[PDB]
């Protein structure tokens, strides 16, 4: 079968297959995965576990595996990793050498041949987690592949206007480096197997998207994976919020998957005892909030890193689903409950469209590089650190997501801006410090049509050569009908008080004051203008230069955001969408469609029962799904602490 | 040349710095009030670099001076072989630079013992000053060549019997066996010159630096064994106020690595931290009359202060002394000459000090120390995910066991004799010791099977020493503990363990354990969870709780819950025969001892209040032989002041 | 000299103090903009700008220099009356924000001759060039002794010095061949920029800027660097210089930094070349923007500090990358910021008090608060670089005494802050003068006499903490055989480390001082002892000639900042003043948390500074000197009631005496 926006969801895990495994454990892994409403496994195709002493290639130990999959019919997902030090958990993210190139072609030749011919598998992953931190700028290959990158592109030093500029040689390198990379490798599979779907899973999405080309990488996948961990991947985020993460990271990679299909291809399976940045076992009721969200936000899978562990060294008998005695932990019994609705939903769940509201949270690579230039990689987890232009963004999709409101959040490029019509859509641009002319020109048109454009923090203080337009002529000036004034640095948590009284706003460490031309301006109660309403052709621009979203964010309060946000929204977004009838802390609502009828998922993170009152579209609430028996009334459902909801609209 | 023994008089010393730009004066105003103080012994650094003269011969006269002046008021000297080094250098080099290097401390030996072997009040060669260290040389080419060998000369498979990836700790192996080498040939070199005088040597830093240390095997090349063990550098791991539970876990460290060897602590903290130490303080008068009597109570046959006397330049200018800038007594000195003094009132009493063994060992191994090394990646967040928690866990038990007044070895696993046909009522904790192979494993059976009592709390077993997780592959303590771990579960850095019926709760540190019994007697918490058990195995038996207690008693700075459970778990034997608290004191400690037939016990007060301390078990009734702030017995209660010193003598 | 001045301007200490701002050139802005920032520059009353001839904007593919982007700038400057600054700034990497602080190498040193031959030649030809800024911000904490020019130059110093390892006496010594080089390697290269300038033009002024004095003072030997300079200047930001204070303090800091830059000028006048005149945005390490009253407070501290200039980094901003829209006093319209307003009430007030302003003298109290390059380095050596802010770490030897001025500023005196060498030990009469030694761990056998000296012909010496603990060797006579027991009449027995902050409290009257760390004790020969309750001694008074020395060995200056408290240090140092700086100055009848004043003469008539930092209006009692406050000065409408002055919260006032 080949993947399409049709296809059945699953829930699936990985299958970790390393030497001195018995055929028996093996076997009763599958049994239970099988018994536990899983289809798909994935498999790590390790080169040390299959090159023998003589260099020849032995795939017995897969072979095995792949066999048992067989048997209990169950679908691999098989993942390229050439051979690697015991101690490289990950995997290398690109040739050592030109003569390691060679070692991964030969690799790549033995096992693709070999594997493509079992009827049971679904799907080459062409590499495991693309992307690192630390690229090996050292190494001999990507220290060739970077100078003649360099050689091929012509930098100046000057702007047309005559400014000094960073041109982000580096960055800009990076980006093609996976790229060529990642195509390489789909070339490679695509020389031997034009049969099975490919496959790739970008991770740790609020770290390193400013490495993902999404858009270039649709050209060589049938399908866009991802790694969302809740230990590794949303340190931005509190526990309690990792719903929020989960449904961000998904909008991510459903951005970046445009037309493809999409499925999170690995998930927290269990726990961490020495492993993890942020370590956790997860609960049952986060399996089942985890598997919703991703469903709902058109995810075609979600496979669980691990079903069984490592036995040796890093993360031995971490991650798990499966107990030490091999049997169900309360995660896998979770896990199953969602498989077995599958197969008795299977038309609903197998037409998921996520319901759009029509907002947009647009995030961009180059604010991400500026932001790493301006911070010099400072990490004091504020505005003047590293990430502040992601968690900006991501406050304002939490304070959407604590309204009951879905919300879109894709990299600019993944915005389409040719449409003749904007009307009753928003962009919010949060903190985006770095817009160049021609996504200013994209944001005039996109306004001019009808849309509703929000910025706050330093939205388009930059250009994309970390040249400032407020300095040199504010590039915005016609778009935002208004020029900035100052900024002044105040405390971590400041209020921005209007004067009509309407609103006291929790702000993050930068005051911005401006002055209106054609904006209608926005005074707060010290006679400062902080914000304006510009109308521009039939669309509206709000913006407010202090960071408010970030304010949310350092004072642990959404609501005042959720408020203000609400009261600029298109009234057909609000009347039409399904939303929470006020703000409420700790509880999320996303809806989807199949087939014509209408679905929400509701997710209580609160300590307490909420009554939440749900207003806009139509029908009237049925409960289809409910872990802890919730009930509604007309269109007021109560829902426990860590339950999950899904109303069915009649 | 006099021969320490088991049976020698303790003694009170200190390092006498000898650097040049002294007078004359000055170091007989030093080894005056050193006699006068009751102190028979200092240790002097017999540094390469104040003898080396221009032409590369050797000129003896600074040390001579020293040698001479001691000798004149009957002061014995442990004498530290340090060859030259850079002033900066402040511990000494750990080994040679390079093979000329060696050929360097060659030459420095034969020149040093040949001539001060020849002094009559030389009592011992320190073979080298605090061998081991952090920052271990392996970017250095003698290091580098000879770790090089040592991978050649062993056998080493990517892949155990069963087919599994295996970790084989070559770096930790080979830098056992590099300190025993080097240790080993600086014995021979000494030996070369002076068959006459006793070897010693100092470890240090011990609760980080055990897993470099392979004490049985310097037994065959030392007469005794010493250790620094200084409050600003080494006690880390603990409160201030529990430096009396540091100090008795650091002197039953040694004991246990010493065997049959006599023991002495070469190095305790005599002075100020100014710029110096991780952890700086000023030892009180009350805490140097603790850590002496803590020391000879655990059969130390000496107490040597760092320093008498300061360094004048950079390092320490002026820190560690006992004397104060005039020469004269701190209040630390005057404290620790009234030891020296109670010794020759109390000699027969103090000569034949044996610990009273209440037959519990609390058993660290080096191999737990090198997994949680690679497990942790190098972490130092100060909790299980963090290098120490394998040293940490074990030593609360070891405090938790301080406040219940009862005795505790603290011992590497391979100094434990496995070898006995009977352990009625003896008890083995190994706390969070989360690397086990099966050797060890089969030995624990046979103590158990022969009536040991095996307490096991955290991650004990988890790994086997190659990091393989049995665990994971088929665990290999299943048949010891009749029974088979099903899920940990991470919670916060302190929950508590509720069990059914409210019989316990037990403060737990980070993750929680669940198992599933299947000859054990299963243990459940309130939430329905089997949380541990004891089997039954044998004429002995295990209590298994997976869960770190130890370090939850640690986490909440109560160790009142895991005495009490421990308690429960002991031989009645132990209970009956050992001197101990009626309940658990926090901030008191126990631990009695035997001379010549007769018991005694040491009790320390570190609370802030005055403390009744109701002592029961074994036979006598209380006569207070020492008690610095006038402690007073009403039958076997002990009325104790804070930072009081008693030791009772059992009629 | 005078025949070299020529038509430029020589600065003296009786010039006309200005207000000025940095003109940021680079290459993309418009002669439009331009003619903008000089126009409003001379509307706001400053009359100077300070400008960066880069390199980088001069040099052409070639190798020739165009000075097109300058030209245009000293123009605009020169059509609106206002002189220049102008800072010798090679060629660098656009991402080097401050400049190199030595060449990288032989070749590196040529390009710059041909840096300083072209630019020095062309824009001396200005006749609105004031001076010649020689390098920006000399210093640095990051040396580069891995590059080639500086690693040889380190070793021919050591090959030209001779040290041994031991001392006369025959003990172990640290020689600090690192610092030593240190300073003598900065003497160089400043004298050897300014011999470069002076190739081409003996016409105007030669100024430098050390910045960062609190931490980089160790690097700087100000009466050297006399002998090639017209004027000393100084980078004083609130954002990168005043770390070791609260924001509510940077009135102490600046008047601290303005009296150290005061000190290390010695005969020479001074300005400060950079305050900070607009926002961090990302930049700075304490970031803030200053309000328009701390724009107020900084300029009259300086000018009460004999300050010849304030310049304001800066006027408009950089554009790209590393503080594009940054520190500007002008807005993003290019317009008066509540700073640029501020800053020009200041102007104003010069060009209406002319006279005054000219001729402003400080008034000496007498107290000087003295630092020495040695106490920092051996302090570097000991604590092994740790920053942990305490006695422990880098910087308590900076602290302790800035906190020793602090309690003087609290208590309305004014105190000097000087480097030992700056002081003069040369006089025969030290009545009524005063020395504090505030944790100065290091003191040689030279100063001791010097210090001997000044005690014997009537000085006062307070020396608190672990002053004279070590020698410039880190050699400690405490231990050896104290080289202070002469002067101190007593000998130190013990220190016994406690928490970082408990209390001394006295055998007498139930007096407590708050004392960090460490605990001193002592044993007296010839001084008088002060007992604790205890029994220890822990402090003396040694009547010395006709002078006294008060010792206690506890650090109660690091006390008093540690417990944020320092009206017991303010009690007790008044208590130890001779009574002559007493009834001479002004001050204030008692100890003021969060007020500040310090006093200046010109022409013959004395006036007083006065700024409220607290959060209420305060009522000062100001006593001593004589006269009678009439207000010249007051941004909140301060109000006098004959010599009590109400003065509001952030309000900065000038008291003129009658
Ligand atoms: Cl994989
Ligand atoms: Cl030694
Ligand atoms: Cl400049």
Redesign the interface.
């Known amino acids: 079968e080949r993947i399409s926006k049709q296809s059945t969801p699953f829930v699936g895990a990985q299958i970790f297959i ?3 495994q018995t055929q028996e454990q093996i076997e009763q892994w599958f049994k239970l995965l099988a018994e536990s409403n899983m289809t798909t496994c994935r498999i790590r195709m390790f080169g040390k576990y299959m090159k023998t002493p003589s260099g020849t290639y032995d795939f017995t130990l897969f072979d095995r595996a792949f066999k048992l999959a067989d048997k209990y019919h169950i679908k691999v997902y098989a993942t390229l990793f050439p051979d690697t030090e ?1 101690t490289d958990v990950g995997g290398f993210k690109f040739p050592h050498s030109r003569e390691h190139q060679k070692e991964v072609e030969d690799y790549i030749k033995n096992v693709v041949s070999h594997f493509s011919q079992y009827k049971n598998l679904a799907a080459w992953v062409l590499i495991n987690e693309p992307g690192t931190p630390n690229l090996p700028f050292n190494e001999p290959f990507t220290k060739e592949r970077f100078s003649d990158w360099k050689k091929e592109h012509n930098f100046s ?3 047309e ?6 041109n982000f040689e580096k960055e800009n390198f990076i980006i093609d480096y996976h790229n060529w990379y990642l195509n390489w490798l789909a070339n490679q599979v695509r020389l031997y197997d034009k049969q099975h779907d490919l496959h790739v899973n970008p991770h740790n999405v609020f770290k390193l998207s400013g490495l993902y080309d999404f858009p270039t990488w649709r050209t060589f996948l049938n399908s866009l994976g991802g790694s969302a961990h809740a230990s590794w991947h949303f340190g931005y985020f509190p526990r309690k919020a990792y719903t929020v993460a989960m449904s961000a990271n998904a909008e991510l990679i459903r951005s970046g998957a445009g037309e493809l299909p999409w499925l999170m291809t690995e998930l927290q399976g269990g ?4 492993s993890g940045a942020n ?3 997860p609960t049952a009721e986060e399996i089942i909030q985890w598997l919703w969200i991703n469903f709902a936000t058109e995810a075609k899978g979600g496979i669980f890193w691990s079903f069984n ?6 993360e ?2 971490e991650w798990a689903m499966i ?3 091999n049997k169900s ?1 309360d995660r896998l019994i979770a896990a199953a409950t969602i498989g077995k609705f599958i197969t008795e939903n299977v038309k609903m769940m197998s037409n998921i469209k996520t319901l759009n509201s029509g907002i947009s949270i647009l995030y961009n690579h180059e604010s991400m590089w500026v932001e790493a ?3 010099r990689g400072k990490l004091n987890g504020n505005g ?1 650190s590293i990430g502040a232009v992601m968690c900006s963004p991501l406050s304002y999709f939490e304070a959407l997501s604590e309204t009951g409101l879905q919300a879109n959040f894709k990299e600019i490029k993944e915005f389409d801006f040719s449409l003749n019509d904007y009307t009753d859509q928003v962009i919010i641009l949060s903190h985006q410090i770095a817009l160049d002319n021609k996504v200013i020109k994209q944001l005039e048109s996109f306004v001019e049509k009808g849309g509703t454009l929000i910025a706050d923090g ?1 939205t388009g ?2 250009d994309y ?4 337009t ?3 002529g ?1 590039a915005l000036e016609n778009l935002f009908g208004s ?7 105040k405390e971590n948590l400041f209020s921005l008080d209007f004067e009509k009284d309407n609103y006291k706003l929790p702000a993050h460490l ?1 005051k911005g004051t401006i ?1 209106t031309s054609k904006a209608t301006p926005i005074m707060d109660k010290e006679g400062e203008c902080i914000a304006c309403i510009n109308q521009y052709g039939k669309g509206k621009v709000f913006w407010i230069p202090s960071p408010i979203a970030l304010g949310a964010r350092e004072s642990k309060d959404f609501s005042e955001l959720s408020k203000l946000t609400v009261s600029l929204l298109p009234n057909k977004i609000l009347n039409d969408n399904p939303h929470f009838d006020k703000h409420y802390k700790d509880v999320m609502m996303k809806s989807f469609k199949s087939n014509g009828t209408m679905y929400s998922l509701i997710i209580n993170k609160s300590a307490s029962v909420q009554t939440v009152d749900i207003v806009g579209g139509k029908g009237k609430a049925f409960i289809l799904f409910a872990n802890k028996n919730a009930h509604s009334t007309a269109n007021k459902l109560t829902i426990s602490p860590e339950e999950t909801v899904i109303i069915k609209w009649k």
Request: include cysteine; proline fraction near 7%.
């Open positions: 390393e030497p001195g015991f030093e000057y702007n206007k005559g400014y000094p500029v960073l726990n961490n005892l020495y370590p956790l076992c562990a490592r036995s040796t060294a890093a031995a008998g107990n030490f005695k932990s230039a301006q911070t003047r330093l203080y930059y050569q970390a040249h400032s407020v300095v040199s504010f020029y900035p004034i100052e900024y002044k640095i930068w002055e």
